[PDB]
Amino acid sequence: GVIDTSAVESAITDGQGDMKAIGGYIVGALVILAVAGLIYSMLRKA
Amino acid sequence: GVIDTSAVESAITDGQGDMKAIGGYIVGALVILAVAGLIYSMLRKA
Amino acid sequence: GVIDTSAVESAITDGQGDMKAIGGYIVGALVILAVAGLIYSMLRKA
Amino acid sequence: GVIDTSAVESAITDGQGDMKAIGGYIVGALVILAVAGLIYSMLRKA
Amino acid sequence: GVIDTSAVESAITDGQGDMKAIGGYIVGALVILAVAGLIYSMLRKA
Amino acid sequence: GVIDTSAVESAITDGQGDMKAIGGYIVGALVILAVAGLIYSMLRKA
Amino acid sequence: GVIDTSAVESAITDGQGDMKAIGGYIVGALVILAVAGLIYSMLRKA
Amino acid sequence: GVIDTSAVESAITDGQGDMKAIGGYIVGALVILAVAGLIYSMLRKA
Amino acid sequence: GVIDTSAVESAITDGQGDMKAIGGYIVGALVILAVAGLIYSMLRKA
Amino acid sequence: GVIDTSAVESAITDGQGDMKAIGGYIVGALVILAVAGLIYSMLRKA
Amino acid sequence: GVIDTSAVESAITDGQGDMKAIGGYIVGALVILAVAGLIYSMLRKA
Amino acid sequence: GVIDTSAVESAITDGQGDMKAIGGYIVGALVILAVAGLIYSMLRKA
Amino acid sequence: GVIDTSAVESAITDGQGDMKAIGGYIVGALVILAVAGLIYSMLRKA
Amino acid sequence: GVIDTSAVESAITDGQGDMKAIGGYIVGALVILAVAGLIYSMLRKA
Amino acid sequence: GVIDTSAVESAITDGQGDMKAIGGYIVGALVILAVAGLIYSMLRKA
Amino acid sequence: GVIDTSAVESAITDGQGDMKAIGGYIVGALVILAVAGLIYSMLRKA
Amino acid sequence: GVIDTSAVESAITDGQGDMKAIGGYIVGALVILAVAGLIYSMLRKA
Amino acid sequence: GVIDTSAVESAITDGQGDMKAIGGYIVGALVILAVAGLIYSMLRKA
Amino acid sequence: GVIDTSAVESAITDGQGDMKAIGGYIVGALVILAVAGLIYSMLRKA
Amino acid sequence: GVIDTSAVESAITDGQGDMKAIGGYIVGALVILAVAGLIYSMLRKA
Amino acid sequence: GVIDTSAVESAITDGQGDMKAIGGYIVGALVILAVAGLIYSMLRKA
Amino acid sequence: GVIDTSAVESAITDGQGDMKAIGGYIVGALVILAVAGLIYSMLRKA
Amino acid sequence: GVIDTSAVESAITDGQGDMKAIGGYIVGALVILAVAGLIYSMLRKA
Amino acid sequence: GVIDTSAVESAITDGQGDMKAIGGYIVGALVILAVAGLIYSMLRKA
Amino acid sequence: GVIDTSAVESAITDGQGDMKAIGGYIVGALVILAVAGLIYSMLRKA
Amino acid sequence: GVIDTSAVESAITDGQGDMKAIGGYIVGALVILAVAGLIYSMLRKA
Amino acid sequence: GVIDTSAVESAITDGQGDMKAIGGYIVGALVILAVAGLIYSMLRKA
Amino acid sequence: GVIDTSAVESAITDGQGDMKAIGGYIVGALVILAVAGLIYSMLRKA
Amino acid sequence: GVIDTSAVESAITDGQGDMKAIGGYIVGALVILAVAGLIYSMLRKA
Amino acid sequence: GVIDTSAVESAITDGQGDMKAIGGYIVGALVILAVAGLIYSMLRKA
Amino acid sequence: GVIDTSAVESAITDGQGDMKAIGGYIVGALVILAVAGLIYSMLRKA
Amino acid sequence: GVIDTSAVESAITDGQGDMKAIGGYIVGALVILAVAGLIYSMLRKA
Amino acid sequence: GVIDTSAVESAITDGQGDMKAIGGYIVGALVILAVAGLIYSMLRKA
Amino acid sequence: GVIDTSAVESAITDGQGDMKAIGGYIVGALVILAVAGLIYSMLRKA
Amino acid sequence: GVIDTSAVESAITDGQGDMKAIGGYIVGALVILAVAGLIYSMLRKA
């Protein structure tokens, strides 16, 4: 008797890996939102 | 007196063996379903 | 006085012997039925 | 006085002897009937 | 004195011989019955 | 006066004895029929 | 004495052989059922 | 002495031949049963 | 001796073929479900 | 000698023919089940 | 002295000859019984 | 010397001939049994 | 010489005829079983 | 020879017809579910 | 000659008739299952 | 010299004639046995 | 010369007549078996 | 001449009568099976 | 002839009746779920 | 032949009717949520 | 003449009686499944 | 001249009469065999 | 002249009587088979 | 005159008695199947 | 006939009762969220 | 041999077609939700 | 006659008992989910 | 007279015993499914 | 004049007496056949 | 005057005595036939 | 006068005795069939 | 007197022994079915 | 002996391959949802 | 009878335990969000 | 008697073991989802 969840380990890792790209790249955009606001408020004060 | 379930032992093993292929290969596809969902939800959050 | 069931012993043995072939070979086919079903149900589950 | 049932003893023995052949050879055929039936029923079961 | 069961031996053998043909040829047909059933049940399972 | 059914007793015993062989050997074949069926049904269930 | 289960051996083999075709071809269709479902569920998730 | 099981050989062959037609034609119908079920289950899944 | 699973091969293929139509056409509808949802969620976000 | 499985060929064909009607008409109903479900799920999503 | 069992030899042969016709022709009919049964059982199985 | 089994040949043929009718007509009914069952099982599956 | 299987032909036909009624009427009931199930499953889906 | 799947055609049609009612009427209710939700979400937004 | 499948026609009709009651009354209950679910899901949405 | 087997010819014919009635009428009853069984088995299958 | 199979004709008819009652009444019971089964299976499906 | 199938008519009726009890009482139990399942599925849905 | 689906009508009604209790009482609980949520969201807004 | 989805039409309508109550009454509560918020924001502005 | 299905009536009743226990006790467990789920969903909402 | 078969006519009638009792009473027992089997098969089906 | 089938009437009755015991007691066991199955299927459903 | 079905009554009772053990013990195992499933579904829900 | 949904009524009530506790206690916490916010905004204004 | 998934192609298309209506009409409502929100926020800003 | 569903009552109770543990322990975890969320939202507000 | 269901009692117990292992070990795996889900949902909430 | 059938009466009685033993003892064995079958079928059902 | 049937009485007794041996010993063999058949049928049933 | 059915009593007992072995040993195998099935279904459920 | 069921005991044991192999090996395959499903559902949940 | 899961390996791969397309193409659309939202929020901030 | 939910109690506890870690650690991060905001607003005021 | 669920224990353990991998690895990905969100909200606040 035997089954193989050997293939799953390699495939799930991949999922984990892209989520990392989606997560990292997603964050890159929020930073544009955050920095532009600090600049807007700075002009906003004067 | 005598019968031969010698042939059966060799044949059943075969059944067991393909079930292993069907089972392993079947699992390979569910993994595509599972990983793609993690990716979909990741885009879904942001 | 005397009769001879000497010939019968040799002939009945033969009957017994073919029945063994018919019985063994018959079983060979049921095994095809049994193994194919295990495979069908395995595909049937997924 | 005298008669001779000397000849009869030798002749009756002969009768007894052929009956033995007819009886033994007759049985040889019933055996073909018996063995073939066991084979027919064996195929008949499967 | 003498009789001849010489002719009987040759004739009974013949009987035995045809019974063999009837028996062998009879069996040939049961085999058609047996094999077709295995095939019918195989289609019957799927 | 006298007759002799002395010879008959010895001869009938013989008949009884072969019937025993025919009966015992006949049974040997039915057993092949019986055991093979139990095996066929066992494969038949799975 | 003699019978011939020579013909049976050749005929039963044939039965065994078609069962193999029926079994193999039957499986070919279950695979269509299995693969289409994986595809249906994949669309079903998104 | 002589008998003729010459006629029997020709006649039994015929029996064997029709059994072949009955067997082949019978199978033709089970196939309709088998294929329609695969189709029914396929609609049944979706 | 002989049987014909020649007809079965041609008939099973047919089953396999329609299952393909049922499977392909079935999928065509899930796609309507999937695309409309992406559109619904898109309006749903704004 | 002769028998006639001429009548059987014509009659079995008929069986095969109705099975075709029962099979085709049966399928007509599963389609109502399948299409209505796609519609139910479509309303079910929105 | 002399008698003539010359005529008997020619006449008994004749008896033997018709018995052959009655025996051969009788067998022709049993064959119809045997073949029809194989056909009946074949329809009987399916 | 002479006897006449001339009449027997013509009469036995007749027996053989009706057996053919009884055999052929008997088979006609089993076919009704066989075809109706295929139809019953077909409705039975769906 | 002569016998009459004239009466048999007329009587067997009758058997064949009722079997037709039993077969046709039997089928009428399976249809109630089949149609009600399609309806039950239809309510069963929704 | 003859059977009648004439009655089946008329009866299956009926099954198909009610399934249509069950299917159409079932859908009528999902629409209440769908429309009420659009209304609930509309109040939900403001 | 004559038999009477007159009684059968009247009796089978009866079977058909109760099946109708069992079928109609059975359906009455599935409707309770179906309607209650629509109500449960309606409360389930809000 | 002379004897008269003239009367015998006319009388034996008569015997032959009644045997024909007994034979024909006897057969009439077996037909009731045969047809009723086909009907019993037909009800027996369904 | 003369014999009388006049009485036989009247008596055999009677046999034929009761067989008809036994046959008809026997069938009446199989119908109870058949109809009850259709009802059992109908409850069995739901 | 005369026989009496008068007693049979009264006795067969009895058989028919108990079969009715066995059939009616048997059905009483299937109903427990059917109703309990509807209840089980009803709890099963909620 | 006769069967009694009189008992079934009374028993199925019962099934229908409890399903009504299970269905009504089940709904009573969903209402607790629904009302509490409206209250939770109301506190949730302020 | 006949079934009755007459009862279903009357029962499904009922389902549709309560869903209307559940839907209408559900909406009554969202309105309390909506109006109170407009009031809260109005106090919130001043 | 006479048989006794008196014993059967008393025994079948018993069967019916246990089925009632199995059915009632079985339902007792589904209720645990149903109530726990309502509780799980209630915690699930908040 | 004269003989007397006057006594025979009266005595043969008697034989005929008892045969009637033996025949009628014999049949009474077969009926027990027949009815019990119908009952056994009825329990056998359910 | 005279014979006595007086003794037979009393003896046959006895046969009829035991057959009744064998028949009644035989049925007692089938009932155990029938009731246990209803119970097995009841556990089998849940 | 006399026979003894005294021994049969005692022996059949025994059969009935073991069937009771086989039936009771058989049921003991189905209960393991039933209870484990309720437990599996309970874990299955949460 | 009879089942018992007596136990269900008592058990469902219980479910309803805890849901009430879960619902009431859940609300107790939202109130902490609501009151603290009013306090936070009050400090927030000054 | 032949089946007809000709009818299915025409029926599935229909399913696909309504899904299109349900999908298009569903979207029509989300647009009301989307546009009204843009208007609400616009008043909300001033 | 007698069966024993005495053992079943004791065994089903057990099933009911574990379901209680699985149900109670399952709920213990949802509470962790519920309480942690109230805490998360509380930090979430400030 | 005597039979031995002594061996059966010991063997059935064994069946019951393994079912216990299969049942207990099966449950061990569902627990992995259940606990992992609680963990997944917990991460899913935050 | 005189003869003595005095001795015959005593001797025939004896014949009648042993037939009773052979008959009673013969029946003892059929009972083993009957009871074992009921047991075999009972295991056969489960 | 005188004759002597003194010698006959002693001699006939002897005849009677051997007939007893032939009769008793003959029966010994039929018993082998009877017992072996019971055994053959017993294997024949299973 | 005298015969001896003394030998028969001892011999029949023997038959009865082996039937007991054949019957007991036969049952031993059915138990393997029964227990393995319970195990197969247990794995079959999970 | 004597027979030999000595050979049967040794042969039946063999049957019992292979059934054990067929049973054990059969189970080996169901385990592949069971374990793969637990794995499929585990991927199925996430 | 032999089966062929050679065809399955090639077919499952295909399933896996399309799932990849459905998965990749599905993701393409979520990206439109994600990017448009970042843009909407960016306009939303200013 | 017996099952073991002993293992489940130990395993569920574990689930409960990690949820505690996930819940506690999750909260640790919200605190960073909360404290940083208080600091941001403090700088925001001056 | 004996079966072997020895192999099952070793195989089920394996299932349990992979489920552990699938469960542990699945969780690894949710953590990416959870941590990225905390980061997104943190940028989202400022």
UniProtKB/Swiss-Prot annotation, chains A, B, C, D, E, F, G, H, I, J, K, L, M, N, O, P, Q, R, S, T, U, V, W, X, Y, Z, AA, AB, AC, AD, AE, AF, AG, AH, AI:
Source domain of life: Viruses
List all topological domains (Periplasmic): 1-21
Keyword annotations for this protein, in alphabetical order, are: Capsid protein, Helical capsid protein, Host membrane, Membrane, Signal, Transmembrane, Transmembrane helix, Virion
Indicate yes or no for the key word Chaperone.
Answer: no
Q: Where in the cell is it found?
A: Virion; Host membrane
Q: What sections of the protein cross the membrane?
A: 22-42
> What's the protein's topology in the membrane?
Single-pass type I membrane protein
> Which sequence ranges are listed under topological domain Cytoplasmic?
43-46
Question: Does the record's keyword annotation contain Membrane?
Answer: yes
Which residues are connected by disulfide bridges in this protein? Answer: none
One GO cellular component assignment for this chain's record is: helical viral capsid
Q: How the protein assembles, per its UniProt entry?
A: Homomultimerizes. There are several thousands of this protein in the phage capsid.
- What's this chain's function? Self assembles to form a helical capsid wrapping up the viral genomic DNA. The capsid displays a filamentous structure with a length of 760-1950 nm and a width of 6-8 nm. The virion assembly and budding take place at the host inner membrane.
* Family, similarity comment: Belongs to the inovirus capsid protein family.
Supply the name of the protein: Capsid protein G8P
Protein source organism: Pseudomonas phage Pf1
Question: Lineage in the entry?
Answer: Viruses, Monodnaviria, Loebvirae, Hofneiviricota, Faserviricetes
